Amino acid sequence: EVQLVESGGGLVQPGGSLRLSCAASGFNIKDTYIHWVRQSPGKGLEWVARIYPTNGYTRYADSVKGRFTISADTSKNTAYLQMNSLRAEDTAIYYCSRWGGDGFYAMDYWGQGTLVTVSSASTKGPSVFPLAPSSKSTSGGTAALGCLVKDYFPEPVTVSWNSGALTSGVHTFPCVLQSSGLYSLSSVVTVPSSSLGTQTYICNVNHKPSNTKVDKKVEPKSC
Amino acid sequence: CQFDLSTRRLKC
Amino acid sequence: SEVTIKVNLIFADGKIQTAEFKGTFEEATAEAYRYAALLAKVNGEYTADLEDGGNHMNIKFAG
Amino acid sequence: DIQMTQSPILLSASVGDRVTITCRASQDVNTAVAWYQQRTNGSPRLLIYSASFLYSGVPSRFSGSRSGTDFTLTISSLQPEDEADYYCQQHYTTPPTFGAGTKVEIKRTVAAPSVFIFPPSDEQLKSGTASVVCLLNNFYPREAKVQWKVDNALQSGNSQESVTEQDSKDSTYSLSSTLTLSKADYEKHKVYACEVTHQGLSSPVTKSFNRGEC
Amino acid sequence: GSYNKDQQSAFYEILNMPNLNEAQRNGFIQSLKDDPSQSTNVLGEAKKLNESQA
Numbered sequence: 001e002v003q004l005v006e007s008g009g010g011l012v013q014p015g016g017s018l019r020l021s022c023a024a025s026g027f028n029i030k031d032t033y034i035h036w037v038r039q040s041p042g043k044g045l046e047w048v049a050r051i052y053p054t055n056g057y058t059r060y061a062d063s064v065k066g067r068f069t070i071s072a073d074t075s076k077n078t079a080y081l082q083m084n085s086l087r088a089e090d091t092a093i094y095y096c097s098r099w100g101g102d103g104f105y106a107m108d109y110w111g112q113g114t115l116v117t118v119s120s121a122s123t124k125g126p127s128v129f130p131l132a133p134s135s136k137s138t139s140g141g142t143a144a145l146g147c148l149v150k151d152y153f154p155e156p157v158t159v160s161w162n163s164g165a166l167t168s169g170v171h172t173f174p175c176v177l178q179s180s181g182l183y184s185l186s187s188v189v190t191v192p193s194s195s196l197g198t199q200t201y202i203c204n205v206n207h208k209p210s211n212t213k214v215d216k217k218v219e220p221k222s223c
Numbered sequence: 224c225q226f227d228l229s230t231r232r233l234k235c
Numbered sequence: 236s237e238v239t240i241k242v243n244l245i246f247a248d249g250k251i252q253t254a255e256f257k258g259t260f261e262e263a264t265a266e267a268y269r270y271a272a273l274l275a276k277v278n279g280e281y282t283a284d285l286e287d288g289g290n291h292m293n294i295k296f297a298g
Numbered sequence: 299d300i301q302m303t304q305s306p307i308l309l310s311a312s313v314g315d316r317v318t319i320t321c322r323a324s325q326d327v328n329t330a331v332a333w334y335q336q337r338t339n340g341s342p343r344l345l346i347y348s349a350s351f352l353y354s355g356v357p358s359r360f361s362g363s364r365s366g367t368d369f370t371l372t373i374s375s376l377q378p379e380d381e382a383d384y385y386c387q388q389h390y391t392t393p394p395t396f397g398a399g400t401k402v403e404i405k406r407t408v409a410a411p412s413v414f415i416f417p418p419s420d421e422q423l424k425s426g427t428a429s430v431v432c433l434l435n436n437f438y439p440r441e442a443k444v445q446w447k448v449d450n451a452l453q454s455g456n457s458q459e460s461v462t463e464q465d466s467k468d469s470t471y472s473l474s475s476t477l478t479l480s481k482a483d484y485e486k487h488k489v490y491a492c493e494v495t496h497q498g499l500s501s502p503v504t505k506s507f508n509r510g511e512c
Numbered sequence: 513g514s515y516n517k518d519q520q521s522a523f524y525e526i527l528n529m530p531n532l533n534e535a536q537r538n539g540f541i542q543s544l545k546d547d548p549s550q551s552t553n554v555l556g557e558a559k560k561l562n563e564s565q566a
Contacts, residue, residue, distance in 0.1 A: 015536065016536070017536060017540075019539075019542070035394075044398055045399075047393050047394045047395070058547055058550070062393075065553050066550065066554050066556055067557050068543075069546035069547040069554065070546070070547065071546040083539075084540050084558075084561075085557055092228075093228060095341060104353070106332035106348070107332070107344065108344045108353060110341040110342055110343070127422070129418075131419070132416070136414060136415045136417075136505065137415070137433070139414075144412075144433055144435060146431075148429055150429065155229060171462050171472045173461070173462060173474050174227070174461070175229050176460050176476075178458070178478075186431060186474050186476070188433060190435065224257075224398075230463065231336060231340060232336070232383060232463055233399050233401040235255065235307065235308045252311040252312075252317065252405075254306035254309045255306055256305055256306050266303075267306075269305070270320060273318070273320060273368075273370070277318075
């Protein structure tokens with residue numbers, strides 16, 4: 001299958017530099033154009049740069065010209081985006097995509113995207129607290145429980161339940177930005193009341209920017 | 224509407 | 236300033252959809268009327284009622 | 299540059315309906331227009347290319363057409379999994395440019411929320427802050443009002459809401475409201491109450507606990 | 513790879529800029545390597561960041 005995988009996004013200070021990679025597989029980038037496209041609150045979807053690896057021709061959006069460079073290493077079937085002199089408005093999800101693959105004159109594969117956060121604030125790992133089931137979180141023979149993932153920076157945080165085996169009834173809320181400048185989110189799951197105390201419930205929290213991995217077991221409260 | 228980075232969805 | 240024109244799209248078979256257009260009041264107005272015209276091609280002639288000083292519309296299609 | 303003007307910005311229809319969204323180029327782009335879908339937490343996915351041609355693997359209920367500089371995307375029978383954002387893109391001149399997007403929501407019947415409340419955990423309480431979480435599960439429509447009361451006094455400015463997008467099976471929303479206090483203030487009061495107002499409820503629901511009880 | 517006297521010149525200017533930190537200097541130098549067609553534009557944005565940090 002055709003696959004594009006971006007890597008390299010992360011926190012960077014205003015004025016700083018970052019380098020993104022786009023590793024392709026299942027086709028040869030010498031046969032297509034490769035583009036970078038970003039997506040941000042202020043501009044939505046916004047094309048950044050393209051390169052035709054066979055001849056090295058490149059084009060750039062006016063707003064990044066001189067600050068970013070696109071390149072490609074065909075021997076590694078990989079393309080790159082050097083980003084210098086970064087500004088707050090460069091904060092975005094950065095996607096790489098192909099164009100002209102198999103004669104299709106559209107961007108028919110996109111990577112999962114990588115998040116670039118331009119800010120002077122520093123990394124901070126979250127605290128993970130249980131949302132314990134109780135008489136105040138049950139009705140109709142089902143019971144809600146969860147995990148509060150509080151005070152982290154920057155995005156993103158991922159949550160799974162029982163190493164991804166538990167997905168039915170899971171709601172992981174979008175993170176909120178607290179007035180402290182730190183993010184916070186909750187993930188809840190609804191389960192049979194009768195399973196509480198026989199079935200183990202664990203939220204697997206990963207915050208890669210701070211190398212925080214937490215596997216928190218959530219149980220009903222003692223008394 | 225407003226694109227939201229966290230969800231990758233427009234917020235209307 | 237920025238306004239949101241809320242629209243009820245009322246089709247002859249009684250199905251109802253809702254849509255929003257945002258912009259200046261004149262931009263949002265022009266876009267709603269243009270969208271109604273386009274939908275009228277497939278769903279029949281439209282009439283548009285304007286409650287709330289224009290900021291809400293009910294757009295019925297003849298079928 | 300060429301701009302792409304998409305309308306409506308938001309469209310909400312029932313399962314099975316025919317929905318039509320539009321995109322207008324600011325000058326001639328021939329047929330060099332594509333349409334992309336974006337689901338929650340996802341990357342843009344190609345649906346239609348060159349104005350009218352269906353990308354391989356895309357359900358045939360999607361279709362596109364062109365009329366001069368006006369382009370339309372049609373979903374002939376809206377499915378719950380079509381709940382997503384839709385973008386048009388011209389590639390006729392450099393830079394390629396995208397529309398601002400149309401958000402497509404699914405209509406369904408009213409459903410009142412399950413309302414649950416969670417005191418601060420003991421772990422959190424060891425270190426100076428208390429978060430109180432109110433949970434509204436699986437309701438529709440999205441509009442809802444949550445008010446916090448602490449010993450019967452209405453709270454303002456110390457709570458924050460988060461809302462999921464429409465669920466994959468049942469098209470409902472869920473919502474959390476978190477009340478944040480100092481540990482000191484939390485232990486200074488007894489009754490913590492979440493009050494929920496929603497169209498599916500015959501009158502507002504109050505879910506509360508007394509600090510310290512079991 | 514190798515470079516002509518013009519690209520060489522741009523390398524030299526960025527190397528000597530006194531108000532860039534080393535992450536910034538090497539980021540711009542990497543850009544010169546990445547895309548020689550962008551040499552003039554990259555030199556100009558390097559100059560702007562250098563002046564702003566005087």
